[PDB]
Ligand binder design. Structure first.
Ligand SMILES: Cn1c(=O)c2c(ncn2C)n(C)c1=O
Ligand SMILES: Cn1c(=O)c2c(ncn2C)n(C)c1=O
Ligand SMILES: Cn1c(=O)c2c(ncn2C)n(C)c1=O
Ligand SMILES: Cn1c(=O)c2c(ncn2C)n(C)c1=O
Ligand SMILES: Cn1c(=O)c2c(ncn2C)n(C)c1=O
Ligand code: FES
Ligand code: FES
Ligand code: FES
Ligand code: FES
Ligand code: FES
Ligand SMILES: [Co+2]
Ligand SMILES: [Co+2]
Ligand SMILES: [Co+2]
Ligand SMILES: [Co+2]
Ligand SMILES: [Co+2]
Lengths: 344, 344, 344, 344, 344
């Protein structure tokens, strides 16, 4: 509904590069993806990742059932070929005739970063960037891109689940927190460069596995849905970074991505993947049970919900500012609001 | 919604006690149930059966995914603990802060009777009672509670199917009626104490199994959806009672309950259970086929439809009286209307 | 619904005679079918195929769960018996009482032809006929009725797929066309007696199987959805006829019928059936991908789309004429419009 | 085991012609079949149906995964081509070299008759013929070949089930016999030309469907597993022929064939197919329950079992005679033994 | 069993390191594997990969259902702890008593190499080594370990399929060879250091995909089941290495491993993985059809089968030498037999 239009102005991940390469035996795509209820197709056309509407201009077949040919995407039905700008450049049935002026499909800003493919549906405000991942190009850290995981929950509810200090004791007792560490601190939160920044020192000496990323937590949250969590672990005295971002596929579904990086990397990737998967399996049934899918005004917050409250407040401001136009939105997103004592 | 609001004032069964005990290994619940399209949770807190909306006040997680701890139902997400009145009495994240006054969920009338759990969503008219089961506390009779059975049919259509004299010869020829006995009598019907009361002396000497409850039929039907049928059986000269009641789960679904009692009880419970299941299997495809799900005004009645006609008329009066308020509803439900020669 | 009302005036196939005879052990039906989102029942009563709304006038049970009893269709619930005109002639519960005037269900035109059962929902314009199959009662030809095939695509899109000259090279390269023969001719198209008639000499010497019906193509397309394609095959110098017609089951679905006839018939029926199934398997994914299901005004045509363009034009004229009434519709359907040199 | 060797000398059906044509899109086969635990392949090579062992001489691949090429069967692995005599005639890898003398596979006598494909594994005694079907080439009769049906029972037990007069009342009460007609007559049985011949006049006026083939029964049973039953029906005064034969696939499995012919043929084939399928569904669970699969010496016969007793006696004689050689076997099979008063 | 005993003297791969790390959340195992019908367990104890019989000495529980605890493998039933030598070092029920001398399980050679785990069941001849992979520690090459693929075919038949020059034209026509290139050369074969070495210049200019490893083929085949194929590709003038090895799981099954390395590595791993999977899908049905599973003496060879013929000859020599003992086996395996012009 109208509520969601403002989200079209952000970059969202739609697939891993691995998913694109696996989709078709050519390794070039095409791959069908869905973002904010739009049916799109991604393909590697020459040196560029390209996103188009997954709908041929001729007779509305899905281009995602087609083939990459040179630097073009060829429709399966009558072979029309589309260039990187979504323009048809070949109509095989009519090689001599002029190509109709309207023989084109919409294309969208599309970039690879961190091993994911990102799409921005509306670029007209031109003030948003791909989220920040702190571990990129840090040679001290081994990076693992997990396979995406799908939840029957919204990106807003997923974000709040990831940053929620209060649930660890109840949803993750064997795994992330002691069940008796249920009272979290109230942390200062800064807005800077379109990111929420805040720091949380979790309890020490908790009976949790050594591969649990538990320690001093530094969050950099690129609004609206990306979370970069840098952990200085207590047990190993080493850096562990979690980068989690949700693709808002439609009104009730998320395709979620986790990339994690670690300084101590002589151990098995699957030690960590299995642990992450366990954490997600603990969250999933409870988060999918939340109803209605979008948080209504009747939910009852407590002081420990500060992160959730401030998140909802900023999202509300972004939605209102989007209605006022590009300049208002840019200010709402990028104006600093500092409440900690840190330098910037 | 509007057409069904009056049904919120009655007691409806939502599960058997056995279902509640089996739902969770604690034997205390919780169990998710649905009544009139409302999502509810049932649990046993101490000596009390409780029913609440299945939605935590904090972040809307389902309490039915939580845990009973003595006299509390604990939400699975952040561990809020609700007492028997639906009030949160512990917020683990803020154990010293005052609990918000809004931290409460709607609590509904919930009572065990006859081995079923009954819920009344609205008690404001204070004039409805749990349906009458004649065999309760008759020490002459052995009582068996069947597992519930789900039909893709409404409670009104199920009620009419149960009391329909004309269909026996076509739906139950091997089983309840001779295929020749298609013409039923037109019987007097009395309203008394919120019940329809009527008697039907079925045909004798029909080629049906001895466990068929066929004989003199005395109906006591607690409006809107319960039927107590006392059979003085021809074949065994002994009493057999069928108590059938439909939970209106939503606009197209019923969860149905059968409790039956018998005076001759030296035989197997499963002789009777299998017979009841055969009868229901004969009804099910035809009743599920009726469309639209609610009887529309264009259905064509004949004189043999008296029970159906009178039932529809009383339901319409109750709907209309509910709009006029508590006193009008009490009169529509509880005023006597006597057609027969009996006194009550 | 509103856009589709004009389609109710045509004869559409709903099942094969084989399907009707297999539906029930009596071989007389009843069989439930769906046409233009209407739920219907088909049965053979005496010598007549009948079609009625699949909904008893009494309590709305499905007559398709009932039984043919001589010259009657009997409802399963209370045994009301309907004659070939849809009128109830027996109410078993009240066999002496007058039958209500309202005890009737809607009866529709229903006729067997070519081994299919055809239904016309609206006969008020009295100007449509069952489509033309040229091989009927041609003793030189062996006729095979294939089993129906269901597609998640509309009847309009299926028709255009069948008559589309341009896609053969991309969808059927191994099978019907050389992949290099992508440029089709622009052929004259005649409207005559409610049929599109046109001829297409396909390319010779293509590397296609001997059982591929490739040759001189003569189309007689009974509007709106039936195609009679007479092929004078290059490879065998013999006649092969394809008759394809789509049942518009609802807004997203077709039940499609293929009947084929051949002059050289000493070979296996299954050589041809397997080839037809291969062609259909090649088309199915691409046609089911077209979205939205109904072609929007934004589709971009090229000159090679003449058949599709002219088809859409005639359908629009018929939809417009239907709003103006019976004589306007008759004119739009049956007036001749001749482009070619041929004489009719 | 050794018990079964004698069965290799008879013709057995292995598939319908329809199954062969459907197996491969060429309609020529190949089709894998199994007979007396031998893995065979059938193909149409030119004008001939050919059966070979399903095992290439080169590297033991299954020829049934190959292709018919001209009048040869081509192995899928390295393309060796086998002629109608099982001889390899092309080794693609070594076109100039002589083909090895041992490059051949066993072939077996293979013929089409009545729309089935028949194989005789051992032709060395040269005294057996394909079973007799009385309706072949009788233009008064419409013939229907049913799809094969598979049972977990032996061909001997299937034969005895088909000719058993005593079970109709218990396995087929609604369907073939009145439940009170349980006492059958003791009929004379003749051996003539390798066939058991006997006649049985079933009870009249039984409450069975009109499509039930009930009447005067004349059996011609080509030993060991084929039954030709000619029924002069009581209800319709018309001829109905049932031809049933079992393929002994292995020690515990049969692939069974039914062909039926009828003089009154204006009705639906599927009336009869559905009835036959119902009969088979009534027999199947009981016959599959018989254990051990081969009848042991401890079974207890009664006088009503005459047909079964005489069948087992003749099979025993054939098994013993096979051990004594070709002349003894020919006499055991073809010597007449007459006990009725009929002409031959 | 008897025929296969000699295979116990070689190193066979049983799982990838990835499979071991994924088996249990600890990433240390245990993992159940099967080799030559032996049930084994693999675990990482400290720095060592260990393999034991998967059967506790106490009450025969599977150790693969247990847990790694530091330098011990702990049985799930009564917690006996086994050291890297298969000796029990803790009996929790009797922690003071002497541990029985019989409280030990069989321990087998187990080593990681190339990302696979290798087991040698019998080390008594002390003359076999883990197979040679030429790309190991070649920094010019990117290495990809595929997931294992399981075939219902033996290791011998899989080896012959991989090195078979003749089948490419029939099994892989679109994919590896022109269908016309059916005649292979007869190449010299050298035995050196327990390897078969031979070179094959495949045909140039074939219509095969660019990612097809087609070019100059140099085989180094570590007996009995590992093949190292170095391809100097015609199409890219670059090195591509295929390392394929079969685990003989039991008498009918192989778990197969492919590792591939490539010099031009800027392209997608999944271009190559998809192509390898296509090749394997083309081979699988034909190789699984070969019967009996072990090649019998009756198979008929042609001159083009030189590689297969020489392979079977060497395997027979090794089986014969094994019966004569350690020094005979060492000689048969490691003595050089040079046919070519090359120098080693
Ligand atoms: C929210 N969240 C996670 O989701 C998570 C985690 N470690 C692993 N995961 C997967 N930590 C520490 C965490 O806070
Ligand atoms: C409606 N109804 C039943 O549903 C029924 C029954 N006996 C068993 N059942 C289950 N009888 C007598 C009956 O009238
Ligand atoms: C559209 N179409 C078909 O669908 C078809 C065909 N031959 C078989 N089929 C099934 N031909 C020639 C054809 O043009
Ligand atoms: C054994 N048998 C049948 O199996 C059968 C049948 N009619 C149909 N079937 C199928 N009859 C009359 C019969 O005797
Ligand atoms: C046997 N074989 C293969 O199995 C193969 C291959 N390339 C990929 N695969 C998988 N080549 C060239 C090959 O000869
Ligand atoms: S629908 Fe894409 S080319 Fe025609
Ligand atoms: S949602 Fe229930 S405690 Fe938070
Ligand atoms: S619903 Fe059809 S007879 Fe009653
Ligand atoms: S296995 Fe048949 S040709 Fe080689
Ligand atoms: S069976 Fe292993 S410790 Fe007992
Ligand atoms: Co969580
Ligand atoms: Co009923
Ligand atoms: Co097509
Ligand atoms: Co039988
Ligand atoms: Co191969």
């Amino acid at each position: 509904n109208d509520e969601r239009e403002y989200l079209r102005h952000f970059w969202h991940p739609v697939c891993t590069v691995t998913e694109l390469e696996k989709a078709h035996p050519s390794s070039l795509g095409p791959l069908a993806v869905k973002l904010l209820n739009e049916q799109l197709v991604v393909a590697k056309l020459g040196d560029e990742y390209v996103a188009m509407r997954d709908r041929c201009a001729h007779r509305s077949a899905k281009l995602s059932l087609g083939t990459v040919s040179g630097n073009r995407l060829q429709c399966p039905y009558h072979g029309w070929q589309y260039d990187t700008h979504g323009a048809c450049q070949l109509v095989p049935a009519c090689p001599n005739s002029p190509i109709p002026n309207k023989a084109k499909v919409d294309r969208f800003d599309c970039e690879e970063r961190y091993g994911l493919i990102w799409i921005r549906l509306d670029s007209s405000f031109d003030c948003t960037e791909i989220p920040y991942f702190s571990a990129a190009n840090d040679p001290r850290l081994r990076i693992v891109i997990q396979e995406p995981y799908w939840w029957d929950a919204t990106a807003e509810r997923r974000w709040e689940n990831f940053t929620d200090f209060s649930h660890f004791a109840f949803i993750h007792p064997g795994t992330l927190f002691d069940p008796n560490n249920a009272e979290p601190p109230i942390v200062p939160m800064d807005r800077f460069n379109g990111q929420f920044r805040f720091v949380y020192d979790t309890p020490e000496d908790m009976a949790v596995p050594n591969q649990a990323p538990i320690g001093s937590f530094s969050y950099t949250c690129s609004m609206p849905f990306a979370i970069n969590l840098e952990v200085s672990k207590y047990s190993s005295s080493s850096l562990h970074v979690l980068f989690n971002v949700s693709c808002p596929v439609d009104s009730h579904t998320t395709k979620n991505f986790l990339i994690f990086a670690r300084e101590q990397s002589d151990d098995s990737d699957y030690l960590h993947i299995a642990f992450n998967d366990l954490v997600f399996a603990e969250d999933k049934p409870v988060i999918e049970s939340q109803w209605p899918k979008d948080a209504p005004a009747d939910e009852v917050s407590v002081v420990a919900d500060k992160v959730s409250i401030q998140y909802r407040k900023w999202l509300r401001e972004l939605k209102e500012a989007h209605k006022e136009g590009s300049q208002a939105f840019r200010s709402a997103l990028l104006d600093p609001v500092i409440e900690s004592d840190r330098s910037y």
